């Protein structure tokens, strides 16, 4: 079993804690936790390439995309490794995160440890938005909070 | 070449940016940067085992020690992989960091990506101190600032 963790922080109200667990090296990764301070509705949720927070979340670069694919949602074949869809917040301003993914990993070439998890301003259109930007970022807006994904006990 | 980066944050502000570069995986890692907000003198400087900052720097656990060795200085054979010695601050509250190390790595089972870099309250005695604790922590005191080590562009 391997485990990872990420503390999400930014310049405004948004903060969270996200845990990762992978029972077997070729198996799915369970992703769970909570984020507070979010507006009601969908917020894009991605692994970005660099675990670099030098100048804030912008330093993390583009979506983690080792296979040079176009942007999509987690249930699509055509997706970046980092494409984890959206988390959804209620009027309480909290998103409960509960995700299983078979494309990210905590080892090998799809490994996300040392990279940056980011929660966005707006919805990810999952590459179905019909514009050029949909196929790169999913039009999810500014980066509200982020952290580096680290090895957990 | 592999590159990594770490943003150190803690109360003070104790704040720094530390860069890592390793030209080849069988080679040394160059470590450089700046830390501000430190009291004059030596401050212990270590890679700790977990990249977990859920409850602050205490969540990072003990020194990274994959080989089950005792604590030492960077030039000692008998050391933890995470043992990077001390950074020194002058009256202007800044430590200039400039370290080359052959034991840490940015890949393999001595890899430090996804773990936590910590700068401490007091001097590391490099395992040469009077006691039990010298062989475990180097007596370097509380954790002033830390961050998770991430992959850089
Ligand atoms: C350490 N574990 C075993 C794995 C199952 N866990 C979870 N997994 C999932 C998941 F990821 F969808 F499977 N969601 C959760 C939501 C809330 C609380 C725990 C969740 C986390 C608890
Ligand atoms: C363009 N480079 C190549 C990477 C190595 N660099 C550095 N290395 C080292 C080192 F790590 F000691 F070799 N010290 C530095 C001190 C100040 C500024 C830069 C330093 C940064 C300069
Ligand atoms: Cu994103
Ligand atoms: Cu330490
Ligand atoms: Zn994407
Ligand atoms: Zn040590």
Swiss-Prot record, chains A, B:
Residues found modified as N-acetylalanine: 1
Query: What is any one GO biological process for this UniProt entry?
Result: sensory perception of sound
Residues bearing N6-acetyllysine are 122, 136
Has the keyword Chaperone been applied to this entry?
no
Q: What is its EC number?
A: 1.15.1.1
Q: Which residues carry this modification: Phosphoserine?
A: 98, 102, 105, 107
Protein name as annotated:
Superoxide dismutase [Cu-Zn]
